[PDB]
């Protein structure tokens, strides 16, 4: 009945919509309660949720579809509620520089402490006694 989307980085979105459609590879499918179990890959497209009072959209990349008469699960490597592929690419490009600068900050933070420890240690050897 309910549908859930999961990501290696954690859960993304969940609802109880009872009608979901998505563009699978070499065809297109519509899911209703009581469906037979099925396995099929998904293309780069935006999944749409309808049976929730109003339409709703979510984008996936490199997805995989798992359907059960009890639950519907979508395995994806990247997801976004903005329904647009271009904004997803822009988000990835934005996060690239952020992670790069975070890594640089971590490296310099470790290096400063290492230098401080080296300077502290040198004085013991200086004090020959």
């Amino acid at each position: 009945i309910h549908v859930s989307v999961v990501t290696p980085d954690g859960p993304v979105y969940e609802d109880d919509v009872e009608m979901v459609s998505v563009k699978a590879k070499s065809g297109e499918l519509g899911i209703l309660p009581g469906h037979i179990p099925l396995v099929a890959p998904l293309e780069i497209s935006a999944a749409r949720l309808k049976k929730g009072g109003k339409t709703q959209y979510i984008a996936v990349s490199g997805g995989f579809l798992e359907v059960r008469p009890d639950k519907v699960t979508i395995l994806a490597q990247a997801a976004e509620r903005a329904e647009d592929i271009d904004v997803l690419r822009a988000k990835a490009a934005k996060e690239r520089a952020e992670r790069r600068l975070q890594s640089q900050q971590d490296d310099i933070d470790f290096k400063r402490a290492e230098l401080a420890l080296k300077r502290a240690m040198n004085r013991l050897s200086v004090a020959e006694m």
Binding site: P37, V39, A40
Partner: protein
């Protein structure tokens, strides 16, 4: 790689990734309606499994 056993103990482990000759089945199994082809599904399915293993390690 090293496996995190406890805050004081770490051990070196060796694991075979592929050709994945050894695998374990689930206690409950259900047949699936392949679409479009069972042979075509595996080609996309397997690399994600390998990448997830690498990420966990």
């Amino acid at each position: 790689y090293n496996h995190y056993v406890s805050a004081i103990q770490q051990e070196v482990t060796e694991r075979k990734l592929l050709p994945l000759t050894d695998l374990a089945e689930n206690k409950q199994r259900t047949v699936y309606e392949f679409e479009p082809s069972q042979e075509e599904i595996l080609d996309v399915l397997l690399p994600q499994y390998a990448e997830s293993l690498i990420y966990g390690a």
